[model samples]
Target: GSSGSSGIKKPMSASALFVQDHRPQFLIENPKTSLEDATLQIEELWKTLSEEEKLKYEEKATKDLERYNSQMKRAIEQESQMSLKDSGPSSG
Candidate 1:
């Protein structure tokens, strides 16, 4: 999804969150493989992840969602504050 113009537009899934941070480390060692190849290989790594190990990323995904929600709320509050500031109350 190209949400380049929209601010605060996304919170990636568990796998999405997991892949990005983990992507670079894999390539650092296996420099022969490009990003795409490393991604394909990493699929196997994900498969072997233990339940306890997966929980850290699962937990992180939920926390990321929480942060997105918080930002959305703050964004609305900011817009409302600006509205009041721009529209002066009518008085004689």
Candidate 2:
């Protein structure tokens, strides 16, 4: 595993992740539906959720944001150190 530029991927938004999490459930619930059809149904369900329901996912997203920030900070620090070590001694 890498933590440099290659590993420092941009995190997905909470709503997108929520959709990802639910995709499997949709598949199980509608085994006859095509993937596209299931996705459309999931999106429709997403649109119909109440604000209170969405808040649960939003709270999960907040936790993800915190994780992303911390990982990014560590990756940046590691990258900086790598650059410093690779540069050799600074010329006077």
Candidate 3:
């Protein structure tokens, strides 16, 4: 992991996709945790996955990023609306 900036380059494989936005969004949504905390938890979970599985997730993320960025935004917005609805009235 110490190959200068080159270390950050991932293989150009369909299964090597990594989308930061979606990853953190998923963590924060599904885990019911703060964004930072969810990100850490997601990273920990990812670390534990078998290399093959991790690559698969990464690839999926990459493909989704390319094809579904808008879909993710809409999904997040719907979740936000649902969360607000569940929270009832707020004084602030």
Candidate 4:
């Protein structure tokens, strides 16, 4: 979602999203573990995942790439329009 003049939102990388999605599970599984340890555990889990498990996140990543490209295009066009407005008419 666009927020004021910020333009389009930046999508999180798939790896980041994966951590976000799993943070709750990590907390539940290891109540006393620190964030650093939890992150390490998650990394280990990622390494051991089957191809099918990885594929689901990979598909989301592909969709996110497309969204980012489309948002960036819109952002550029908006910036160009704003620049033109600020510059006003060009001198002859």
Model 3 spans > 4 angstroms off? 5-24, 27-32, 57-92
Candidate 3 structure quality by residue, lDDT tens digits, 7-48: 222334333234364565676557676677756655666567
Error of 4 at 67 (Å): 2.3
**Per-residue lDDT for 75 in model 4?**
69
Candidate 2 Cα deviation (angstroms), residue 22:
2.9
TM-scores across all candidates?
Answer: 0.57, 0.58, 0.35, 0.58
TM-score of 3: 0.35
Q: Which pairs clash in the backbone of model 3? A: none
Give the alpha carbon lDDT tens digit for every residue of 1-92 in model 4. Answer: 34324445567766667887887788898779888888888878887889888888988887867876676665666562354335557786
Q: Provide the clashing-pair count of each candidate structure.
A: 0, 0, 0, 0
State the C-alpha lDDT per candidate. 0.72, 0.71, 0.51, 0.72
Looking at model 4, the pairs that clash are none
Q: Residue 60 in model 4: shift from native, Å? A: 1.7
Candidate 2 weakest ten by summed lDDT:
1-10
Model 3: worst 10 consecutive residues (lDDT sum): 1-10
Better-scoring candidate (lDDT), 2 or 4? 4
What is the RMSD of candidate 4? 6.3
